[PDB]
């Protein structure tokens, strides 16, 4: 039931599975034209553009991590340390 | 009706491909037809077509070659039927095995 | 405009209405112009990732993404370092390829 | 049907989005016209706020408002407002204000009190026939005494 | 605790659960000849206090059923005289972690 | 992980006088009540 | 019966709508779909109260199509017709089986068999009217109708009533 | 009662259907605008009589076509009035 | 490509299993399916009440399936029912029925033994359903006499017989020896008398699962989508083995109806029943051990539903 | 080409769910059915150009849910039903 | 002791073949064979007879019997199992899909 | 047993023809018969007695005990005992009469579609363009006692009065 931030016990690193999914999802949205938050270098491929955002943490998503009890944490993809 | 979309141009009137004709996949070697009862189906345009459902044995989709030989013969019980023999050169290729 | 027969081309179009137009027979009508949100089905082109598999497939290694390089003739070509995890040797062996159809999935393959 | 047994959502017991319990809200149509006409007024402001950076005369004044606030794709509301307007017993909320008070005293069920103010009744039997659940709960005269008062408080058309 | 030499009449065994809460553990002499726990393969066991337990379950967010289960007839279980719903801890010396705690619950 | 272990074990099985090898492994997984060559090692 | 109720609804944004102003888009789709629509459960949805305080909750993204789903809790006014209910209405269409009563957004039909014996249909009038021993039922004429039965369909509602009994008929 | 399905192009509408069907792609397409119409195209007395008849034609070594023409014939006659007899030997012959 | 629907889209989470209340069957089913014929007398269209009528879903892409309309693509297919003249056993549960009987009384329909017994008291504490049924059945199979009075209780001191499965039948054995095959109805009656406490004390759920439902008083008919026709040469009609089985179960049923209706030797009845039971049995399971298999006219064994699910390349 | 049990398991071993789902739905077969919210059965009669629905016998014209399943799983159910087993389905968690 | 001994038994047939498998995997296997409190075979008998969801059980070995006993006992299936979610064709609670992705308004404004 | 015999005669008048009534009266004349006694007593055959026996078995009208005469001369003796059970007959007649009264106490169809509609379907089928009830799929036109049941009920009322007299 949405453990509060002070009590969030999980790994602040972004598991590869997460990074994979967020990439896919964001890239999909981008392909569907949802606004892009980073100035392109001339990029075209959405998946590239997605990674380009992920580097700068401009991706505006939030991960809901279900614990086995049924509860969850919500980490913002911007606060998760990556790599 | 129900006619296949391979080209029939090669067929001689009898419904066979005279040998020596170069054929390719989806071509129709043997033009065979069946009668249909008008009331039986009336599916799609069958009422307008009035007549004969198309059953023709095509050449294999992927093959091609030259018809070597065609023979016609009545079998044991008297039905006219035909065999067709299509020769093709298969040249050694990258995928081929030895 | 390149049509289905030339390689860099598209087989079908899907309008935002969710209706597929076959590009064969489209030329007879003579013109098609795309609008954002339409989905065009294009031939595989260089760098599209694809799963690739050699059965019985008893390793998680036995199914791996790959980055397509279109080349002529018939067999799938692949480097020989990768022959061991598939438990593969090149005599009559065959390998099933699988194209993901969704941008999401396409990403997952490259990233996992 | 009306035994005063309604749907699950239409059950007398309600709860708000804050999680607090509430009694069901039923409406005779006087204020029912007004509240709808009410909200559209503030709704019109919010449209112009973000834009910066007789009873016959009522029908057309609403329709124009229906062309502004509402996209115009709603016929039902256009049908509803007219329905509300023509059959409204009480024109002014000021009048309705006492009506909402008067009608609810004994604590009659929401469905009951709604039909009372939304319909014209004279005799107790008239009401209690149209609303069968009022038979044994309230005396005939106590009802009519209100029914008399209601017809008196009716806004002159 | 009652140690017997060879065997006991079934009637006597039946009369054993006759004094709750008190219980009677019954061991064979020939069975106790060697303590099992001294054996190499048996890692140290610890019985737990209910308070400690409720802490355990709360911290891992578990139902009793969800714990790895141990059976009453287990020689170790008999040895410590466990009862149902009582949690034991096990410290096994791991060749990866080097000290690995574990938790089980009598059936 | 569960799969990854299952594969990880079953694969070296594919590449396979005390009973040994695959047939031994079969005994183990089956938890055979009775096995071919029971044995002890006493110190 | 005109009531008010707290209602929930789920909404789907196409990705292109995710700009910061999106909440406004939410309130837009909410009004567009909800107001004027019907739902078999809660009846005809009329107007949405409390426009400003609408709760957005927390938007979840679903699998493929990448479209954001939401759950909106709002308070609104809706009309739910009921069986054994007395209502007033103005005729619109006239059939030999009966005249169709317009009550609010809802069109109620009354069967001729549900009508008194003295009440008779007249096709010799323009438009066709019902001429009883006393009252004459025409389009613009007002009639008090007690609703006998209701049919509730997801997204629609239709129903029947009878003026046969006492305290009923033309207004 | 109705139940007959016809395939028509809502964008063309000019004619009734004039289409081609693609078996490999398992889809059916209007030949004009090149629109796909459909997808996922899927790929006691008597028995006694025919028994003894079967035996007879068999002993006679007549090819199955003849046998089956006679079967068909006999079914048409069957129980009809005008036959009015013949004991089942005459009819079989 | 399927047509739009305004229904709310959700994903399955919980999945609950049970048995069909024959009442609910009838509530669901759209036809009685009286006539064993397949197509119409005209030889086109459908028998309209035969095994396949437009009420059930329709194939061929040109037929709109009267009840749903829509297509063959859209139509889920719909269920028919058949009213069994005489009740029959669902094969899969023949075993568990046998145990159930052995567990309970055969007259007053009460659990043998009782709560008063200590062993029973112990077993009832078990939370696992299956284990509870097993443990209890160890006790109740042994005691062969229901008893009117017990020291610290139901009546009917009748001696509970031994039940032995023999050839798709159950045979009672009384030492009192009295040997009687056990008819369906009497058994069903017993199950009807089982108290809620009783069967819920066994592995059954009062809502979804009743021994009454384990016995078949009526039967569902799958739409053709389960059992489609196939065409050979595309000019010859091919019928599915399930369709042939429905034709058999029907014909057998109609026979048993008529024989029951009039002219009953009661040796013919008991046979005609055993025929019905057999057809329905091999319909659900062809491969039951010791019984004769149902052979399609070609000599091949019929492929029963169970065969469709069972092996590799089965549906699962 | 056949994408089998083992092949699946390799996917699970990579932990890529989306791909698996796609490859077992869009890539092969996907089917859309309506189910009652009382009886979990597929009984629902959906007649729509009219947006009309009834599950007869639980008498629900109101609450019906839309789902997608592989066409085969559909068969698996209808088979069970034809075998007199009810595989009721529910989109909410009653056990909680 | 049964556990550790078991690991030792397994570990032998691997080192016998000369192959090497990480300690983890064998450990995981053993522990699964154990937690029931007695040695649970890997057979139609041993694990398949546990209480896990019907679909998951019926897929492995005896499908008709498992389904009949399920419907007999009115067994509930939560569908947290992998194979179950597969049969139903919905995204499994594993890997990529073990968690769920949401949009936040807060960071989106900034 | 005169009242029971009169009720049985009334049931014979209501249910079936006169031959069944005569067979019941013949059983009433003679105390007990075994499976062959009606045949000796009646000019009807045993196979036809069998259709009538199946008709009696369909209802609760009478009762059968199945008994063997044990003495071992050849195959012994199949004797059937037909004895009327009054309670089952009383219960079945009451259920039938009450059900009949319920049936007495208790519409749109398209010619080409052969469908069927009801009042709730009437609200759905109404069209504003024309004035008519239109079919759903085919859009075809729609088309489509108690006092007589009450008079036949007057016959039922004498039977109910006879049942009340039999009860008390
Ligand atoms: Mg090789
Ligand atoms: Zn076209
Ligand atoms: Zn249908
Ligand atoms: Zn008893
Ligand atoms: Zn339902």
Tab-separated table of C-alpha atoms in Angstrom, chain A residues 37 58 60 78, chain G residues 20, chain K residues 104-110:
chain	number	residue	atom	x	y	z
A	37	UNK	CA	12.489	16.588	-23.649
A	58	UNK	CA	14.607	13.450	-18.712
A	60	UNK	CA	9.202	11.313	-17.061
A	78	UNK	CA	14.953	10.239	-12.385
G	20	UNK	CA	2.590	19.339	-18.869
K	104	UNK	CA	3.991	10.833	-12.795
K	105	UNK	CA	2.683	14.365	-13.179
K	106	UNK	CA	5.194	15.945	-10.793
K	107	UNK	CA	8.468	15.446	-12.647
K	108	UNK	CA	6.564	15.863	-15.920
K	109	UNK	CA	5.766	19.501	-15.109
K	110	UNK	CA	9.467	20.095	-14.506
